[PDB]
Design a protein around this ligand. Structure first.
Ligand SMILES: [Ca+2]
Ligand SMILES: [Ca+2]
Ligand SMILES: [Ca+2]
Ligand SMILES: [Ca+2]
Ligand SMILES: [Ca+2]
Ligand SMILES: [Ca+2]
Ligand SMILES: [Ca+2]
Ligand SMILES: [Ca+2]
Ligand SMILES: [Ca+2]
Ligand SMILES: [Ca+2]
Ligand SMILES: [Cl-]
Ligand SMILES: [Cl-]
Ligand SMILES: [Cl-]
Ligand SMILES: [Cl-]
Lengths: 636, 636
């Protein structure tokens, strides 16, 4: 199962073969044996393993212990597992014998120069030059290095390495080249890679160990496809490779680096390869523990920021604030994982105009990569539309990193470049949904995942006008139809206070909400099929819908469109019907959520938001702790 | 495992749902049930199947036979397996009951309009909307239709169908649309496909059955991505799809066609898809039975044509002749297979200048497709360099259609476009070899497969200078060293007659042939690894090599470079050393080949060929009978 070479010898003059450690070499001859050959012996220098074997069977046997009956169907294998100290310091001698004369008929001498050449980066073990998925898989992982680790950088753009810890983001690659030095006066050692892969990653050799930035010499890049390793350190050269791109429509995600020994007296005689896989971008669903909460602070945002602050302080989350409102629409905080340094990465939306500067200015710290996709020939659904489900099992397949959720229309959608990127990540197969019926059309407007210690660890919450129908009808059956919805609130336009009886007896509103629930039910069945969830995991949240056109906006603050930080969720305060001094919508929300251990804090956001068609989740972003499940053993 | 719909009803007014035959429909309600509901009954029109089932378990049970205790966790499924004869001719009625009053509390009525819509082409059986490989696989096959079946055509270029049997090359696609006619006054039926797939195939509707060419109306093409089926024939519309491209670097080979029912009062409510796979181009190795032999006839080709004729008449082969010599370098005759019409297809080389006109002029008959690949920014190895091995097993994988064999260099080759095409065929994974050492550098110069009823059904024959060393040395050991090689031949340049002693005692020639055999041995080991052959299947043919530069040409006529037609092979007549009135090279060739049942006829081609660096296989092409193994159950 190794490399096979055939080196033929002649009875007239000896040969001077060069072999690689561990590799087998078949030994045969040019021309015929002596005229009366009946037997033969073979001998080898210490450190030279010689085996005899028939060409039919594959059992090997030591060959330097007897006189073998001659047979053209036998073959001799020479292996040197250790490199030579000097040129041709070992040799093989084949003597041909006959029972007639006592002396050998002829000799065949082959001197050997053994060289130990090997290229290895990180053979993930827990094995050819192939990358395979699964728990029984192997292969090296290469990151994309999309951050700014050096204080001077304002990391993929430089052809130099001017940071002392940016190297932590790269992948090592060691080339051992043991053997006689004079051999390298006759033979070349060449590292190389295909030009396509050369445009996707860069390699740096080392010329002074671990201390000098200028010592990390760039050897492979955009135009540099090959390089001659001078063996500056001796018998081992160290390289650092950094990726330049993420898996995309045209890039499968694998890059090959080869080393080759050439005989320029040129003919190559050995080549070794190493295959890296570019680690993909992984999204974090709301079920994971949060790390940093992001929220804006605008000219009239007074208590929304205070509520987000005082409510994220319960889960121990950060509070980075932007001076310029939809901080969940501009960015999605995922990550890219490596066996050495897994770093979070922001994906910046092409929906620009308000926070278009925030990611490239105040989000890529030392360990914070940045990636973005802008189409050539516009986004209307963008990163409110981009969510991710928890790990699921459906259609027989298992999705241990969950699945991506994006919106669109069936007969015609989010831009094709973002779709191609998400589908090319290959680790969270997206599910395109029906969202075109909403005004802005974001997935998080009707769907939200919440952690709950029962059933599957989580509950999928869907907005349902039928749930609000039932709640308002049961309250009519109690007599509270005269309770008013928009009663307690700082008049933002003197919004007229409607009552339960007025809502239930408005034929147009009820029929439109029936249509809305039909849309959400189509999405519900698609979610149950593509995520493998049952009704035990699906909870309907009461929500009615307004409209000023053929598309749908929220009537009262959207209850699913909340901020989920582990055990604590910030929900927009539903300025619904007060029945006993407490909002009955809040009571229903509590009866549905608090039995799951969660704590519901409702935020007044009627004046800052919900009048510009947004809720707390639309104005609050969050990055989360990566999955415990590692992405390489995923078997797509 | 089918499509799931949820249609909600109201106790105030009935609903008018439209359903698809076979599809299940969950029935729920907007709002709550009557205030004192304890039980319920459900009833359905004949032909309406109603089942009750808990939302936890998946056992279904008929629901219209008892009064069920009310439970919100129960669900009712409605299925109509047969289309309706008139709008809303069937209905479901849900009555809500209490033990207090004897009459029903409330009713919920849902009228149903059932439509039977299905798109099917050829579900290969021996099952979703996916194409899977293997004996247990399914899916439709679409050809590329690269021939000229109509007498007027001079078939992928026309947007019309002006042939009566060109339709045999296309694939059928039937759309059944049973149901009430008035429904189609309210609903649209739309066939469609993605624009990428639209550029790869065309679809024609039928407006008059089986007789009129203008009736095969073009409905889907380069710009036409969607079409409205008018139901011109009633409850079933017939379409004919023809492919426009072969699998390539950017084309995986799958095209999807969808049908959709729209409600323009528009909202789609059902979509059905059909996935075709474009059949690839398959090569035929020399082991298969031949059909047609091609050979040129040039201004001084007198007996080579006669020998090819009189030697192909033994296997019952055709004899198409071109008036303009390398007919095996310009074209490769493969085929494309379909469950209805498998047609042979020529692949035209970009090595042009002598026979550049032959394929597009005198090779694409009625059933003979044409495909070609020309690079933007030149071929020096071309279709002498392109061969194919018999079915093999190696690296665990099984290659039942053999593997493709092309030449090149390791450290840098055949053009990248041809490589991408061959690799994208996906059915015969190519093996790139070392051929750069030869003058012209074609695979067939040193390698040829021959049928032999033993071992594996075939023998791989490799040119070997060591075999010629052994033969000439054993003849020296007999005393025939004074036998002359180029003795019997019509002087083409008064080529000097060399003898065995002169050859064996020429140090430069022997060393160069040793180097040549080392190259061929590298290729031999790569072939044994990538094809899984042993020495029992490998036969070495004696062949020496000349040179006028650093590259290698043949010394005497190349013995492997022969024409293999099943049981009969035409070999270039080796004008080698005559020892007993018979060429000893011919005697060795016979001793190696004739024990395999084959019959060896040696052709004098020294004056026509072998002086312009070519042999019989280089001047004779042949197409062969396709494999008995069908390509779809290949599991790549
Ligand atoms: Ca850097
Ligand atoms: Ca960095
Ligand atoms: Ca870093
Ligand atoms: Ca932006
Ligand atoms: Ca998001
Ligand atoms: Ca046609
Ligand atoms: Ca045709
Ligand atoms: Ca035809
Ligand atoms: Ca051509
Ligand atoms: Ca060929
Ligand atoms: Cl000898
Ligand atoms: Cl409900
Ligand atoms: Cl009621
Ligand atoms: Cl040999």
């Amino acid at each position: 199962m190794s490399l096979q070479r055939i080196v033929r010898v002649s009875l007239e003059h000896p040969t001077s073969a060069v072999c690689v450690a561990g590799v087998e070499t078949l030994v045969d001859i040019y021309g015929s044996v002596p005229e009366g050959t009946e037997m033969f012996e073979v001998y080898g220098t210490p450190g030279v393993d010689i085996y005899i074997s028939p060409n039919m069977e594959r059992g090997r046997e030591r060959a330097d212990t007897r006189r073998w009956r001659f047979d053209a169907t036998l073959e001799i294998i020479v292996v040197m597992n250790s490199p030579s100290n000097d040129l041709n310091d070992s040799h093989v001698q084949i003597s041909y014998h006959s029972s007639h004369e006592p002396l050998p008929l002829a000799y065949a001498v082959l001197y050997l120069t053994c060289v130990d050449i090997s290229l290895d980066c990180d053979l993930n073990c827990e094995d050819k030059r192939q990358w395979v998925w699964g728990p029984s898989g192997y292969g090296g992982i290469l990151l994309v290095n999309c951050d700014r680790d050096d204080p001077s950088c304002d990391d993929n753009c430089d052809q130099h390495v001017h940071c002392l810890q940016d190297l932590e983001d790269m992948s090592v690659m060691v080339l051992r080249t043991q053997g006689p030095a004079a051999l390298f006066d006759d033979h070349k050692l060449v590292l190389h890679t295909s030009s396509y892969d050369a445009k996707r990653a860069q390699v740096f050799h080392i010329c002074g160990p671990e201390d000098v930035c200028e010592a990390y010499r760039h050897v492979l890049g955009q135009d540099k496809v090959s390089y001659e390793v001078p063996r500056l350190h001796g018998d081992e050269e160290r390289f650092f490779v950094e990726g330049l791109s993420f898996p995309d429509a045209g890039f499968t995600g694998l890059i090959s680096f080869h080393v080759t020994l050439l005989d320029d007296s040129a003919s190559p005689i050995f080549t070794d390869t190493v295959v890296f896989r570019v680690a993909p971008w992984i999204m974090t669903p709301s079920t994971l523990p949060p790390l940093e909460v992001y929220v804006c602070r605008v000219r009239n945002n007074t208590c929304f920021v205070d509520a987000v602050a005082e409510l994220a302080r319960k889960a121990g989350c950060k509070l980075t604030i932007c001076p310029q409102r939809w901080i969940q629409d501009e960015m999605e905080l995922g990550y890219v994982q490596a066996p050495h340094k897994t770093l979070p990465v922001v994906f910046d939306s092409p929906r620009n105009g308000e926070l278009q500067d925030f990611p490239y200015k105040r989000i890529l710290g030392p360990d914070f990569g940045y990636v973005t996709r802008e189409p050539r020939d516009s986004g209307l659904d963008s990163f409110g539309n981009l969510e991710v489900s928890p790990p699921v099992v459906a259609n027989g397949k298992e999705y241990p990193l969950g699945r991506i959720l994006i919106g669109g229309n069936l007969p015609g959608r989010v831009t094709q470049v973002v779709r191609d990127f998400l589908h090319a990540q290959k680790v969270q197969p997206p599910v395109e949904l029906f969202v075109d019926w909403l005004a802005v059309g974001h997935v998080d407007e009707f769907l939200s995942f919440v952690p709950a210690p029962d059933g599957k660890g989580f509950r999928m919450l869907l907005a349902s006008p039928g749930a609000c129908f039932k709640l308002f009808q049961e309250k009519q059956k109690c007599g509270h139809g005269r309770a008013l919805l928009f009663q307690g609130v700082v008049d933002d336009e003197q919004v007229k206070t409607i009552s339960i009886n007025q809502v239930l007896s408005n034929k147009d509103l009820i029929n439109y909400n029936k249509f809305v629930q039909s849309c959400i039910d189509w999405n519900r069945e698609v979610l149950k099929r593509e995520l493998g969830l049952a009704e035990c995991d699906i909870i309907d949240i009461p929500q009615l819908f307004k409209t000023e056109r053929k598309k749908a906006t929220a009537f009262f603050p959207d209850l699913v469109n909340m901020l989920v930080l582990g055990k604590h969720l910030g929900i927009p305060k539903p300025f619904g019907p007060i029945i006993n001094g407490c909002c009955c919508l809040e009571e229903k929300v509590r009866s549905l959520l608090e039995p799951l251990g969660l704590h519901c804090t409702f935020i007044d956001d009627f004046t800052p938001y919900h009048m510009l068609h947004g809720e707390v989740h639309c104005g609050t972003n969050v990055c989360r702790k990566p999955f415990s499940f590692k992405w390489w053993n995923m078997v797509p």
